[PDB]
């Protein structure tokens, strides 16, 4: 599967069939759907601060770069522990740079972070938690040009040695908590699905209110240091534009943690 | 029996109709980062849109849109090739939602949308033909607003009660179909893209007029109530509502021929 060509997200459904299924993510937030839910608690962020004496993994797949995040962090605050597996982002191309997922008001952000967790209080791993009930959660942070962010220079200063499907880089651990915006406290939420294949509609999806900002050229480095192809592809793909059209979103609420 | 929700929605229409998961997707969300003006796009001609009133033409619902069809005498000049009308047709949202137009502006939804379906008359005897041939088929579209009450568009609305059910058909009294069209039609956006539904040629040289006309909210109701995409006698009736496809990739440039 791809994000582009015959085996784009139109056709996701042909071999993964969530993808044509009910409560299909990403959706436009905008103020007709939204409601306040004054049970909407703020999260705290738990074992975010990775020893430095420790190296997380950061992948590409041909379909995303990841940082492999260890069990130990979870978010607290939801009915049960939810452990973090993976970090990734999503993002568009130097001519059209607005490739969040989720939109607000029917506009793209530059990009948008997603810290990937699952229910390791009901599961034994997020693979097994992805097609169960309560299985996952995903924050979703927005991503703004704007100054130069040090905390995700973290994580871009590595994206070279991860050019191509296939590559791996170690990362020395980092607070990840500084990749989260300002007023954690104030999200969106509601209940959907992957954005990827295999689309399973188990994600309790949070998406911060606050964009952050990273720096124009920060912003360039992620749209053009990776490609989606092996480095001896004789037929390079740059990874550019690896972000889901919104989905229809009919008779449902967002709820939000503000009013 | 494809349609716009469940199992048989648009993100499952590719795997009966391959085009659906092919190239040149439309619609598409018209923003400033793909837009360009192009000098070239002078305005086009519409020739015989002014229907007789003492003439007919059949309005008929076939279970996934509801089709006025249109005389090949009715034409658009100014493209390469002579195109000649076929149908017109709209899609909508529903009454909680009344946010149902196909192409969408800076991210935002218009209320409905007016497409009136053209063939290359010149090259092709029809646009059953013409829908597999390279630029065969011309599509003008016009976004709708909610606001003021449309007369115009009334000539057609104030018939939908009598074609609720698929395969039900009306006459329409023939008026003038330029009055579908707003102002300033020389201001246009221009692509190259598809069919919006099933089985999503991409054959369609898109115009989409730059500023919206008007109906109201009665219309709109009237509009989002009236129809069914499902036979008189069904016993699993379906409203035919929320009849607009998402947005595609733009994979493209849009023209203009406005420069501001
Ligand atoms: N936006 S997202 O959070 O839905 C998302 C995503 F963008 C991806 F690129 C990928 C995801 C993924 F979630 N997964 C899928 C998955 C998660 C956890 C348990 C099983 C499978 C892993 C494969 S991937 O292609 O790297
Ligand atoms: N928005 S659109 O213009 O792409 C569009 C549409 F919305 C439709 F609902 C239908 C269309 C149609 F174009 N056609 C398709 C077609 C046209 C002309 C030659 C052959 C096939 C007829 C079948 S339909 O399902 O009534
Ligand atoms: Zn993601
Ligand atoms: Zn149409």
Redesign the pocket.
Known sequence: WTYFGPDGENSWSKKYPSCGGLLQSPIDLHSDILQYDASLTPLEFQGYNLSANKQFLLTN?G??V?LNLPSDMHIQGLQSRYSA?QL?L?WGNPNDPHGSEHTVSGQHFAAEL?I?HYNSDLYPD??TA?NKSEG?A?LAVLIEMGSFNPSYDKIFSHLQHVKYKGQEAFVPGFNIEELLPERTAEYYRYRGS???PPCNPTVLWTVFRNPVQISQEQLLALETALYCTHMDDPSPREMINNFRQVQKFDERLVYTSFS
Do not use: D, G, M, R
């Open positions: 797949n379909h995303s990841k597996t990734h999503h997603h990937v997020a693979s992805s996952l995903v992957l954005t990827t």
